[PDB]
A paper describes a structure:
Remarkable stealth activities exhibited by coronaviruses are facilitated by a series of non-structural proteins (Nsps), such as [name], which is a uridine-specific endoribonuclease that mediates evasion of host detection of viral double-stranded RNA (dsRNA). [name] limits the abundance and length of poly(U) within the negative strand RNA 5ʹ-extension by trimming down the initially synthesized poly(U) lead sequence to the optimal length that can suppress dsRNA formation but still serves as a template for poly(A) tail of the positive strand genome of the coronaviruses. [name] C-terminal domain (CTD) belongs to a family of endoribonuclease with two conserved catalytic histidine residues (H234 and H249), which serve as general acid and general base, respectively, to attack the 3ʹ-phosphate of the target uridine. Cryogenic electron microscopy (cryoEM) revealed [name] hexamer structures at 2.3–3.3 Å resolution at various functional states, including RNA-free and two dsRNA-bound states.
[name]-[name]-2 Nsp8, a previously hypothesized cofactor of the [name], was also added to facilitate the [name]-RNA interaction. CryoEM imaging shows that an equimolar ratio of [name]:RNA resulted in mostly apo-[name] (and data set 1 in Fig. S2) and that an excess amount of RNA with the [name]:RNA ratio of 1:10 yielded a complex with the available RNA binding sites within the functional oligomer of [name] occupied by RNA (data sets 2 and 3 in Fig. S2). Multiclass ab initio 3D reconstruction showed that 37% of the particles belong to RNA-free apo-[name], and 39% belong to [name] in complex with obvious dsRNA. The apo-[name] was reconstructed as a homohexamer with D3 symmetry and refined to 2.3 Å resolution. The hexamer forms a barrel-like architecture with a central channel, which consists of a head-to-head stack of two trimers (defined as top and bottom). Comparison of subunit A structures in its RNA-bound form and its apo-form showed an r.m.s.d. of 0.388 Å, indicating that the binding of RNA does not induce significant global conformational changes to [name] protomer. Superimposition of the apo-[name] and RNA-bound subunit A structures showed that the C-terminal end glutamine residue clashes with the flipped uracil base. In the RNA-bound structure, the 344KLQ346 patch swung away from the active site pocket, allowing the substrate uracil base to fit into the pocket.
Residue numbers in the entry:
A (entry chain E), B (entry chain C), C (entry chain B), D (entry chain A), E (entry chain F): 1 to 346
Amino acid sequence: SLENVAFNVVNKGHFDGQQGEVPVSIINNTVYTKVDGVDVELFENKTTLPVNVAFELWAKRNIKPVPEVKILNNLGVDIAANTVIWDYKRDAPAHISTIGVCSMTDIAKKPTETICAPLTVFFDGRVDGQVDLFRNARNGVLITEGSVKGLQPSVGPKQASLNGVTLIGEAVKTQFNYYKKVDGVVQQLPETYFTQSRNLQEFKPRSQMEIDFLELAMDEFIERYKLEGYAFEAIVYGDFSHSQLGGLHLLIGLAKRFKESPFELEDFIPMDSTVKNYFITDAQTGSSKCVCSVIDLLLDDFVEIIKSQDLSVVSKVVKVTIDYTEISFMLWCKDGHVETFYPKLQ
Amino acid sequence: SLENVAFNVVNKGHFDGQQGEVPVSIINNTVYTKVDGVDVELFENKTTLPVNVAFELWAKRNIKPVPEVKILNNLGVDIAANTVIWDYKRDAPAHISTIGVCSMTDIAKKPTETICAPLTVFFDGRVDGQVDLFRNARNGVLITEGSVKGLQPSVGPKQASLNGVTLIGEAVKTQFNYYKKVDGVVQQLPETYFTQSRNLQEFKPRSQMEIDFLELAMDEFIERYKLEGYAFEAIVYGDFSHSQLGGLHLLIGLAKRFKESPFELEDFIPMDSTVKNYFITDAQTGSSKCVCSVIDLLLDDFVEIIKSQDLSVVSKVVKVTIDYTEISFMLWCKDGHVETFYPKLQ
Amino acid sequence: SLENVAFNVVNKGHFDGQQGEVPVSIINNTVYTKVDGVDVELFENKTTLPVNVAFELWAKRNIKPVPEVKILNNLGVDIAANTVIWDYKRDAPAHISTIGVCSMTDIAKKPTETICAPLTVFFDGRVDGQVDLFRNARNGVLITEGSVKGLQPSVGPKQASLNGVTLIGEAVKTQFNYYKKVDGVVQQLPETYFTQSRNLQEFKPRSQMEIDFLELAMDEFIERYKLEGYAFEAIVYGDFSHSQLGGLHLLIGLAKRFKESPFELEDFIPMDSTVKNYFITDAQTGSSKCVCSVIDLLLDDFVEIIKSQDLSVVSKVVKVTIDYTEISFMLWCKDGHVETFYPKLQ
Amino acid sequence: SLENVAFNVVNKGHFDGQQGEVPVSIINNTVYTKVDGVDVELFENKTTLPVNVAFELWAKRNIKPVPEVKILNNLGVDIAANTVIWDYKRDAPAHISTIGVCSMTDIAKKPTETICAPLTVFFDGRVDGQVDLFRNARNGVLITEGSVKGLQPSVGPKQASLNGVTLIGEAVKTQFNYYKKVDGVVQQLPETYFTQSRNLQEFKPRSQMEIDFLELAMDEFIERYKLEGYAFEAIVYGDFSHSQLGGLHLLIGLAKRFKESPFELEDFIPMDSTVKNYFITDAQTGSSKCVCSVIDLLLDDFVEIIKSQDLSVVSKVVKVTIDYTEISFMLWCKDGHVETFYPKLQ
Amino acid sequence: SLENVAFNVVNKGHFDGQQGEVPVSIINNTVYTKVDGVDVELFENKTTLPVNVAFELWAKRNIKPVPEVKILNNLGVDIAANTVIWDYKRDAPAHISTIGVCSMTDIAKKPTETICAPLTVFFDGRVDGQVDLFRNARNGVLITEGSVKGLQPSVGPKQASLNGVTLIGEAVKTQFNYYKKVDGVVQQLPETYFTQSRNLQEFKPRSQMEIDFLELAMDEFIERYKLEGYAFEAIVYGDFSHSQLGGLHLLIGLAKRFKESPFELEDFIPMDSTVKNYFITDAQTGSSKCVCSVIDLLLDDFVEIIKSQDLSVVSKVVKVTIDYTEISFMLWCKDGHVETFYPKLQ
């Protein structure tokens, strides 16, 4: 019930299944509740769904640490089992349909129904009975905080999403084991690098090499870590000398530049992806690139990736498994050294 | 509950207090329900209220014969006791607030609370206990289908409103006895004429004089009923010879003209009133008046009113009690005969 | 393209696949085009879809005679193959998804894809290759204007829908042969009666018994056709003597009453169904029923149905196959004669 | 002022320049006023303009007989001098800009400013000083009810538009003399036929030939008026024997067909033009044409036009001056008789 | 007038009663004005009121230092006398109705009318004649910057709200004397603590103990101020070791934590109250509580409150008068020391 959902929201901050109702008014894609005679905004609908439907899905969103939406997208997750994964990047539910959550968006009450068999259902082992549900599911992705009998685990990212806050858990567990079934057969998830899901204005180094990159100058870091011939001056640090911005394809380089000269990042596709494209405008020099592909990889991981390449090729597409998906990089080299390395197709 | 209100609407045509819910989507000031996977419109909000609030008030509207909104307005009714009077002219609730109906519009649960004491509460004797509630109310209007002990009744209009259909009841009782209390004192409602609440395109004569007016020509009807010197040719039949339309202040004359030449009536204040103002454009001659005051009185009643006037005055304002309210008419006369008679202030 | 769709609409009345564009402005769920410098409304979105999506689906609607939406719903049709069935009752597409029509609503380009296998796809034999597509479809409904090799046909209703106009075709063929496949197996469609899809204000008799019903009085028609003991006075003609309206469950009886006394029909679920529920208010007597189940059966067909019943039962649920679906009727009888016969569950 | 405009609307039906204000609430592209504590709708914005701007322009619309919008469009009128021409077909102002009417839409206060020199300003001689303004205007169209010194008049249509009602005036003058200036030079308006601006459901014959067409059968009318060899059976009466509707390009033929069999006319470009295109669906036969060009010419005028053609040509484009604009007709003939005659380019 | 209100807004920043008008366009719940031919946004309606009504109320808001909305709510203020109190937390007027401000929201022109007698009217002594109006008011709250003859004052908070900025005035007076009348009798306002209305990201200590709390560690501050046995480690500093966040019920503790580790505060009821509830998510540890009751009391005041309690009780509800209202705290103790102290009912 709309009024019951609003009662739960005003009294517990989210839907907890408590009984009770409050007066609700809907207007301008917004849900208001009346507190002491004055209307108070509870929810502004930013989705393509009806306002009441979006309000109910947002109230019933998972408030426990959940995998980032990019991870679920790369795993082909189409729907979640008896929960709502809220996409905080889009301010919308991460999946079109639900299973036993909202009457307007449900396609089934339980993930065992025939409509969910072709779909890759997301299962959370922390909920009782979902491991068995995944065991009997034709297609599904399972996350657990521990081991599963007879199933080889895939270690996921250290970080997870908690109410829209991406963090590495200390008081809560955010590292999950990932399991995937396709057509009833348990798959072996590929060995992968993971993006760190960091922010430009709140960048924090997670390794010694990243610390050195942030504090040391360009030449000192390049010489210290034996990174001559890999075009780190352009790929990571970025070139701001021409009207068209060069390189700057790692979030750590953008953060280092932002520390000295705050610039502009236009996120013209505001969603959660392994590779993010930005319309970057440098506020100090005026160098700008309309499509700048940025990936937030650990600098140690990116150094390993670039050093594992074969430099004796002019043009070559590099396939790297990042966040359980294959990211294709363009590798331009000359005279046995790198001239360019960015995610292709920007 | 919104969903429960919609369940009642889809299963019973209105709110009947039945338990159950249906999937509901709200968009574009419209309430949709999902029937077999496709959204079906249940209600389009034409009010100034929030869409869900208006939907709930419309579902809980009185489906029994109720007094016309103009009658309640003339009696000073500000609010109804535990019911919603729906104004079908405005497609909106007839009163801003409610008593024990909708959480968003309620000012009280029962009419006995202190907030309802200054307000003139509408009481329906057909509902059990409302006669006693009116007896203890400081201000109120009571309607009954029978007598009330110790209270002198006022006979109201023969017709009432049934789901937006104004009719004189045959299988149901539409004539009510009216009682009014002001500051705890029972008032004597004035003797009044009543408008017939008829429509232009569905006009039906309710008296022999009206039949004669509709069939007989102007001169024959005027001579037959001894109506010489009262300007019936202009006041009732209307003058379509000049660019500015003359007279035509009785609905029966407009209906007679519409039978021969269908014309235009712009209702620029679409509400329920004893006197209606129209922007009339005659489609045959081009005569038009931007403000034409029309009252739907019984022709026999209007003849009595015009013949009860004193013709030996040049200009005089005539006060007639119509629908429990005082309607002021302008009476222009010359040489002991009427030149004009219309509701004043148009 | 939105602009190309609008170009086709302004130049051909619907989408015909012609190249060209016109200036388009979208506002207030409405599509406007500019003709000679002034904006002209092309489409008002009454659906739950985005305005541009609904505009494109409406432009690409089938303009050939198509089965009524109620027939497709009773056959379990979930989606149409490479066409849009427009539901003119709801002013919306009859199906949520499309196959190769609109990028925003498509789930597949051709009905042969895996996503369409569980769905009952609607196939039109008048389109080249759709008979073969239906032959290879797991679930589907096929309509043809002629015979299909090896497939036993089911004769459908005489009438079809042509641009929202239900008619029995003379210059065009509106009677179709119906074929159904469930899980790859051709089904035998049950022998059924068909509703006539007539309107109250435009009722036309399609049989001699209907003509007699319309012209003859109650007693004369009942005695002429040997209809004593089947409660035709209540079930068909209707009882307007009490406050609660009695019977009136056939559209022909409502039309006969409307001819003498125009009344009110509130269609509180405005969709296309075999059985329609109305909030009926009789304008002459005041008799009203909030839920009146009305079915537009041929009077000869209804007489056969009521005479095929076993009168020696007090209460019995009658299952009649109407419009390829099972309609359940309540049959109350006493002393070997009918007291009541209406669609159950109103 | 918005509130002053609403005061004028509620007290006079339109803007009359009276002082005073009323409480106004704007919501959902609708202007509401509060009468006795309840909001009453004054105006629903159907234009592309802001709701308050459209409300002000609608209140200040010309309430005197004005030329039909199609006539002003054919004369190239871009703007009106100190008045608003309301297009009742579109429920919008006929011109984008105004001169001294509304602050949001004004481009000038008087038509003498430099911005109005390239524009063809509409002048009304019935307003004092507008004849002199037109005399000094570079581009303009003048209408008068009488003669103008030194200017040769062009006799316009007998009918005009009065508050959205097209009529031939009896108590008011609706026939105007038309004058046009282009680049400061008085033009000679071409001799033209005029459309009658009649409606399908309210068709009234304006000539003896039209009366005969309506009452007499096809063969009798064709033989009586010597109309053999001009394909009147198809062009005017229409062919309903095939799936594609044939002919029916005169409003009188559509009205004659509508008298016997009411059909469907989808006006997919709802504006005012000399030639109207309809998506016609015949409800009796099923014959339908998505683009049917219909012109409402006097039948005597159309007979003269078709008889003034040279029948000894296979294909020929006929240019007819109708409503001060050149309408191009396609004329297909064989063996010295007409096979087809419709407005070209439908 | 809407246009006059907009003129005042564009020329003075708010309504000052100046004459003049500017072109105004209303669309999408937004008021635009035209400056040099381009529309400029003046106001975005975030209220439940009509856009023009909300715009007028916002323009006429009090721009002088006014009591915080929480204070007026705790005093039972229902309406303000001839002024608008704008609630900047909700971006809406603090009261539903007005007295002599806006025609659409006024219930009276002066606070002396009968409709305002049951309501607690807010009076501002800084406006001439409002002290006398409060003297004759049945129910009211009066604020003055000085003494009132014969009335015992209540010293209010040091801070007030100035155009949405809460500050302790230096060039202006923000400390008011408060007076309350209920049913015509002057009340004695209870002795109370006052919240400091500080922000998390702009926290500034207002006492020496607060400075020590911010700079000193947990153990040093607890030992210095003799705060052993009152569970300051949990109640104020907060526990971030478990998945469920513990304590953290004082804004100073949240600010201290935010200084070291910026976290998330979801204000799911965005209004002004003495006790605020937040959905807190700690970005460093992952500890989160969906309902965290936070009160911004002076740390010296909270120490006095917690030390004035009787520790020899297991469970006890503590009633503290804060901001002229009774705040109920839960006090759990064991072995003569505090285990928990938070506002109850979160």
